[PDB]
C-alpha cells in the first residue's frame, strides 16, 4: 500500500574524459493509492530506461504515511534541517487545497481537506525533504489517546 506518482528527474554530467553523460537521476512514488505515500529515488541512465531503472532504486524503500483519513484534524506539519512545510486543516468540501510543487502529493494521500502553507527552504533536492517532513512525522489520533493512559476520548 503506497502511492503512484512521478517526482522529478536530473541530468548528471560530470567533468570526465569523454562526452558527459546525462543520466536522468529520477525519483518516483509507486503503489496503488492507499494513503501511505511511499516515494523513493534512483540514479539511472537511459532516456526511456532511467525512469524504470530509477524506480528500481525508488521502490527499494518506499516510506509509510500512517494517514488519519479525511483529514489530520489538527495542524499538521514537520521539519528536517532546512526543509519543512505546514498544513492548516480546513473543510474537506473545498476542492483541492494545495501549494505549488506539493499539489500532486496532496492528491496522493487522501485527505484533500487541509491547505498547504508552502514553507521551507529554496533547495530542490531538499524540496522533497521539506515536502516529506510534513507527513513523515505523523501519529494517529485514537492510538495516541489510547497510549496516553486514558481512553480514545477521555482526553478530548
Amino acid at each position: 500500500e503506497f502511492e503512484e506518482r512521478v517526482v522529478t528527474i536530473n541530468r548528471v554530467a560530470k567533468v570526465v574524459k569523454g562526452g558527459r553523460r546525462f543520466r536522468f537521476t529520477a525519483l518516483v512514488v509507486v503503489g496503488d493509492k492507499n494513503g501511505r505515500v511511499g516515494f523513493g529515488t534512483g540514479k539511472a541512465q537511459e532516456v526511456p530506461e532511467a525512469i524504470k531503472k530509477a524506480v528500481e532504486a525508488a521502490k527499494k524503500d518506499l516510506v509509510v504515511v500512517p494517514r488519519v483519513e479525511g483529514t489530520t484534524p489538527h495542524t499538521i506539519t514537520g521539519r528536517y534541517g532546512s526543509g519543512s512545510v505546514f498544513m492548516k486543516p480546513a473543510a474537506p468540501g473545498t476542492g483541492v487545497i494545495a501549494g505549488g510543487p506539493v499539489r500532486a502529493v496532496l492528491e496522493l494521500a487522501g485527505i484533500t481537506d487541509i491547505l498547504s502553507k508552502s514553507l521551507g527552504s529554496n533547495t530542490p533536492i531538499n524540496m522533497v525533504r521539506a515536502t516529506i517532513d510534513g507527513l513523515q512525522n505523523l501519529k494517529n489520533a485514537e492510538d495516541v489517546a489510547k497510549l496516553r493512559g486514558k481512553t480514545v476520548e477521555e482526553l478530548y
Binding site: K17, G18, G19, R21
Partner: protein, 202 residues
Amino acid sequence: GQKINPIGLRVGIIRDWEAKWYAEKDFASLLHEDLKIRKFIDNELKEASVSHVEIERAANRINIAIHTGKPGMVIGKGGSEIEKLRNKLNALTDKKVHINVIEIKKVDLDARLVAENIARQLENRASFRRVQKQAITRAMKLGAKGIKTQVSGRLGGADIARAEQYSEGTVPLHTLRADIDYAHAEADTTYGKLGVKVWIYR
C-alpha cells in the same frame, strides 16, 4: 588526434589473404582489366553495405569475384544480370560469365566493409536517427571482436567523430590475434576536411 590510418590489424592468425590471382601477362593492361573494373559498382548496388573483400581470378578464366551479397541487384531472376554480364563484362574481363553472389548473414558483423552500412545511416541528415540509423541499435551485441564505434558524417559540419563510455572493471585484457580495419568516406564539409570515420561494433 595525430593518428595514422591502419589497414591490417594482427595478421598471422586471424587476418588472412585471399590472393588467388593469375593474370600474369600485361601488368599494364590485363591488370587494368581486373583493377579498374573495381571502380565501377560503387553506385549501382543501392547502398550495398557489404561484408568484406574476397577477390579471386580463376587462372585467367576470370569470373569476376566481388560478392556484395544483397540479393536481387546481382542475381536478377535465374541468370538475368549474371547472363547479361556474360556479354557485357567481356569488356571488363575475358569472359565474365555468370558473375556470382552470396547471402549476407548479419553484414554489420563484418569488421571491414560495415562502414557503408553506417555511412548510409547518417549521410541523409534528415530523420537520420530512426529511418536510417535504426541499425546502429540493431547491430550492437552479436559479439564482434573489435569493440569500437564512432560516427562523424555531416553532423552540424563536424570534423571529428563521437564516442561513449562509463567506468569500472577488471580483466587480463591482452589479446594479440584479433581482426579490424579502417573506414573513411566522401562527405562534403565545404571548408575544412573530414571524410567520415565510421565503424560500429556487433
